[PDB]
Amino acid sequence: HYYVSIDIGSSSVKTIVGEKFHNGINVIGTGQTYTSGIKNGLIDDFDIARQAIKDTIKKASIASGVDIKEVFLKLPIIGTEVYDESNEIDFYEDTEINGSHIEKVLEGIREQETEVINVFPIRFIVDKENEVSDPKELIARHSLKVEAGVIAIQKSILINMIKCVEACGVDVLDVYSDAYNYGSILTATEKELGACVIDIGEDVTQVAFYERGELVDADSIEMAGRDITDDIAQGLNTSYETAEKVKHQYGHAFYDSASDQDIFTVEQVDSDETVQYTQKDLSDFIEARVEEIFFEVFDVLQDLGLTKVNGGFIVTGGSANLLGVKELLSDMVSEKVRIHTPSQMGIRKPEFSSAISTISSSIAFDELLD
């Protein structure tokens, strides 16, 4: 009927209630609630977080008209495993492969410390020979085999993340690693060539790489928005708060493009005085940090041995609202670089990318298995 996804982020818990249309999703209600209950993408104070999630589920339950009781929880690429696996189910009759055989054969893969959370198909193989993308309505005589991609997350995260959302009085129908979700924000062309999604939130920066249409591998960095603000507060000798504002109001991640005529005033933290800075001044600190962030990204890529990103670079997430971000990355790499923002209205901010893709993934599996 209705699709409701929940994004439990370090800056704000995000919720989206949507409806499936022929050419996409129709957001009919959203909610957002800032919280200090989540840090580095994990629950820092259960109670505080459990209250943020409820508030978010409410603000949306109101704005959407729907009375939310079921939700799809996204999971951060943290303590996550992305590997290859296959499985085959047998037949004793002439069976017309339907959505239920897909699930049955995938379930086997969903099989110690971790737990398979997502199993997605790469290619199926009917009666031990017909290699095909879709095996539906095709007739199987002896067997249906699937070579899939699998994602596992550490049991500690899964459990508590769900214990917290379910403590709000709603059921978690399913879970979706952002490592799978980002596939949505891409284009078929990007997925094919080898695109790299860079989601810079507040505490975490997630990196996902897709090639030939499927996810290849993923990881995260504990450096993001907050660190930009931290760098700003120290550089202008000011409070975190005012630092978090001038970043929003005047932030520019590329030095060579920040204004001088643009001036603002920040108060000092050690005196009852006030200093005046230009946008460019602020830029020095911002670019520096956003750069160190991309340098981390590259390393993640090297570790995962995922060089070559002919698919290009896609950057998103809250910090993606920063000006000059596209400029800076393009200046330190040689592939296309775009800042993905949800198309649907109401959620036309980079920070909503993950939440909306969670719904996409939901719907995607809904069809695959029916």
Residue 272 beta carbon to ligand ATP: minimum distance, rounded to whole angstroms: 27
DSSP class per residue in 199-264: EE-SS-EEEEEEETTEEEEEEEES-SHHHHHHHHHHHTT--HHHHHHHHHHH-BS-GGG--SS-EE
Told to check if 31 binds ligand ATP by CB under 6 A, we report: no
Told to check if 201 binds Mg ion by CB under 5 A, we report: yes
d(CA 352, CA 355): 5
- Within 35-54, the residues that bind ligand ATP by CB under 6 A are 41
Told to check if 204 binds ligand ATP by CB under 6 A, we report: yes
d(CA 133, CA 109): 18
d(CA 63, CA 264): 36
- Within 301-340, the residues that bind ligand ATP by CB under 6 A are 317-319, 321-322
Our CB check for ligand ATP shows the closer of 194 and 317 to be 317
Our CB check for ligand ATP shows the closer of 81 and 231 to be 231
d(CA 350, CA 339): 8
Told to check if 342 binds ligand ATP by CB under 6 A, we report: no
Among Mg ion, ligand ATP, none, partner that 244 touches (CB below 5 to 8 angstroms by kind): ligand ATP
Cα dihedral 365→368→369→370 (10° resolution): 120
Our CB check for ligand ATP shows the closer of 296 and 351 to be 351
Separation in Å, CA 222 to CA 76, 204, 299: 12, 5, 13
Pick the piece of the chain touching ligand ATP (CB under 6 A) from 92-100, 108-116, 242-250, 332-340.
242-250
Told to check if 252 binds ligand ATP by CB under 6 A, we report: no
Pick the piece of the chain touching ligand ATP (CB under 6 A) from 10-18, 85-93, 272-280, 292-300.
10-18
Footprint of ligand ATP (CB under 6 A): 9-12, 41, 201-204, 224-226, 244, 247-248, 251, 317-319, 321-322, 351
